[PDB]
Paper text:
FARP1 (FERM, RhoGEF and pleckstrin domain-containing protein 1) and its close homolog FARP2 were identified as guanine nucleotide exchange factors (GEFs) for RhoGTPases that play regulatory roles in neuronal development. FARP1 and FARP2 share a conserved domain architecture, containing a N-terminal 4.1, ezrin, radixin and moesin (FERM) domain, which is followed by a long linker (~200 residues) that connects to a Dbl-homology (DH) domain and two pleckstrin homology (PH) domains. We determined crystal structures of the FERM domains of zebrafish FARP1 (zfFARP1), mouse FARP2 (mFARP2) and zebrafish FARP2 (zfFARP2). As expected from their high degree of sequence identity (>60%), the structures of these FERM domains are very similar to one another, with root mean square deviations within 1.0 Å.
The corresponding site in the FERM domains of FARP1 and FARP2 contains a negatively charged residue (Asp97, Glu100 and Asp107 in zfFARP1, mFARP2 and zfFARP2, respectively), suggesting that it cannot serve as a phosphatidylinositol binding site in these FERM domains. Interestingly, both the FERM domains of mFARP2 and zfFARP2 form similar head-to-tail packing patterns in the crystal lattices, as a result of interactions between the positively charged and the negatively charged faces of the proteins. These packing patterns lead to a linear array of the FERM molecules, which may cause the oligomerization and precipitation of the proteins. The first arginine residue in the KRKR motif (Arg277) in the FERM domain of mFARP2 makes a salt bridge with Asp216 from the neighboring protomer in the linear array. An equivalent salt bridge (Arg284-Asp223) is also present in the structure of the FERM domain of zfFARP2. The KRKR motif in the FERM domains responsible for phospholipid binding is buried in the oligomerization interface. We speculate that the oligomerization, if occurs in the cell, could be a mechanism for regulating membrane targeting of FARP1 and FARP2.
Numbering used by the authors: 49 to 294, 298 to 331
């Protein structure tokens, strides 16, 4: 048979895709990339909402019908999968635009936590990009009907104040400022995978362009560069980081919630390493 799949773009606009029932994840990804003419598409992937309404990555090598129960009723969305160290250096204006929309998303849903002043500054550039130069009446109208920050009301004056500085800046220049600000934040591109150490201390694991990170709360306790990592594995609920000597306990153990969570994080790490270090 044939399927009709709904995919939400980074600009929040939903389009519909007609695909055969035999389609892999890769076919849908390719059709989405073609529809929006995304040339630098390797940084991006698709996630969907499972029945507990959590977001899961679409596996491009598996059949879609084997990953999702009601593909016709399921929401998919375009997302950045791999954050490069400096998205401002991406070649295409459209790609940088998509990255600024990813930041916009992360800022609103709280993935990108930062100080209030930094949030306000990011939001002020985001306002410049959508509606142009500062206007008292138009800025208040926009902020009434658009939410950029999780707790925006008491920050709105600061957002507008800062927006007065950006007179004359084009949407592309605005996107660039958003990327330059965001790439310098500790939480940029960060996605937490909760776990506990040997002592039982709650921590968060994450993977990024340089290697693995360890967080306690929102403060980063450690970074293991790819060069320092000998091997990554998982044994049931345990995730294992084997380090190169120098030097005797060369293994860090982290207990995660389920085996499937270990596995998802392991795959994420192997994919990151491959993407940022290996030539296919």
């Amino acid at each position: 048979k044939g399927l009709q799949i709904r995919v939400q773009g980074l600009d929040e606009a939903q389009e519909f895709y007609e695909l055969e029932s035999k389609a892999d994840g890769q076919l849908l990804l390719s059709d989405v990339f073609r529809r929006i003419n995304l040339i630098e598409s390797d940084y991006f992937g698709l996630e969907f909402q499972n029945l507990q309404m959590n977001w899961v990555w679409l596996d491009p090598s598996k059949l879609i019908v084997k990953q999702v129960r009601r593909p016709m009723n399921t929401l998919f969305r375009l997302s950045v999968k791999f954050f490069p160290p400096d998205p401002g250096q991406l070649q295409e204006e459209f790609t940088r635009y998509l990255f600024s929309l990813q930041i916009k998303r992360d800022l609103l849903d709280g993935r990108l936590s930062c100080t209030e002043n930094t949030a306000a500054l990011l939001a002020s550039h985001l306002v410049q990009s959508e509606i142009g130069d500062y206007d008292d009446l138009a800025d208040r109208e926009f902020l009434k009907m658009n939410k950029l920050l999780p707790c925006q009301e008491h920050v709105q004056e600061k957002i507008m104040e800062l927006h007065r500085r950006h007179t004359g800046q084009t949407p592309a220049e605005s996107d660039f400022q958003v990327l330059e600000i965001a790439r310098k934040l500790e939480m940029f591109g960060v996605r937490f995978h909760p776990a506990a150490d040997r002592e039982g201390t709650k921590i968060n694991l994450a993977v990024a362009h340089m290697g693995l990170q360890v967080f306690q709360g929102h403060t980063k306790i450690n970074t293991f560069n790819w060069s320092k990592i000998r091997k990554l594995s998982f044994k049931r609920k345990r995730f294992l980081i084997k380090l190169h000597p120098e030097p005797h306990q060369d293994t860090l153990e982290f207990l995660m919630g389920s085996r499937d969570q270990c596995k998802i994080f392991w795959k994420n790490c192997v994919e990151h390493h491959s993407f940022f270090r290996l030539l296919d």
